[PDB]
Chains A and B, each alone.
With several copies, the nearest count.
Chain A
């Protein structure tokens, strides 16, 4: 690993019958424990529920 590690993400789910897909990318410092990312809802947008429930999964 390096001190700035990039990451890539894909997400698919159903919440209260609403299907959606997300993608994301970001970067962080693995050793300082910090990270940033962008998330885009590519299917099922605009999200009909609070994005907050997906935060711990991203």
Chain B
């Protein structure tokens, strides 16, 4: 849900720029224990309502793993790197799933974000980071959930350059 990001430091907002046309994204997440989760998403603006359409194909998750055993404890906060490739915006991230016994299971997200707007109408951002926090509440077992997310797009201010780079 990439429309909801706070941008700092004069970084152009690829997603908000994409309206009214909207955008798509496509991702494969590769899990360290062999699972794959692939998704395609369409984002459109319908009046005063954003509309998401998602397609999912997941496979090879180990039967004994935290995913198939339904014993996962949510995600740690994450950091995504984003930069231009082939005139579109690519995203790369590692995430860590909380597991029983204070353990983590890691995975890698390979994303391409595609504006439905022509290149001529878009300001492409420079290399930058997006900090994400996703928090989930299971309201009814396997049936009803609530999800909260916070996201910020930024440069690396925490570790400063000595060449005056971002």
Query: Is there a contact between chains A and B in the complex with CB atoms less than 8 Å apart?
Result: yes
Q: Among residues 16 to 53 in chain A, which have CB atoms less than 8 Å away from a CB atom of chain B?
A: 16-17, 22, 24, 26, 28-41, 45-53
Q: Tell me if B48 counts as interface (CB < 8 A to partner A).
A: yes
Are A10 and B54 in contact, with the CB atoms below 8 A?
A: yes
A16–B71 alpha-carbon span in the complex (Å): 16
Would A39 and B147 count as touching, CB distance under 8 A? Answer: yes
> B125: shortest Cβ distance to chain A, in Å?
15
Q: Given contacts A45-B143, A50-B66, A58-B147, is CB(A11)–CB(B54) below 8 Å?
A: yes
Within 8 A of A (CB), among B44-95: 46, 48-61, 66-72, 74-75, 95
Which A residues are CB-close (under 8 A) to B71?
50
Residue contact B50 to A6, C-beta cutoff 8 Å: yes
Range, interface on chain B: 35 or more
B144 proximity list for chain A (CB < 8 A): 38-41
Inter-chain contact B142/A10, CB cutoff 8 Å:
no
A52 surroundings in chain B (CB, below 8 A): 67, 72, 74-75, 97, 136
Q: Tell me whether B52 and A9 are in contact (CB under 8 A).
A: yes
Residues A8 and B48 in contact, CB atoms below 8 Å apart: no
**Interface on B for A, CB 8 Å cutoff?**
1, 3-7, 16, 19, 24, 26-27, 29, 35, 37, 39-41, 46, 48-61, 66-72, 74-75, 95, 97, 109, 112, 114, 134, 136, 138-139, 141-153, 159
A residues with a Cβ closer than 8 A to B are 1-2, 5-17, 22, 24, 26, 28-41, 45-58
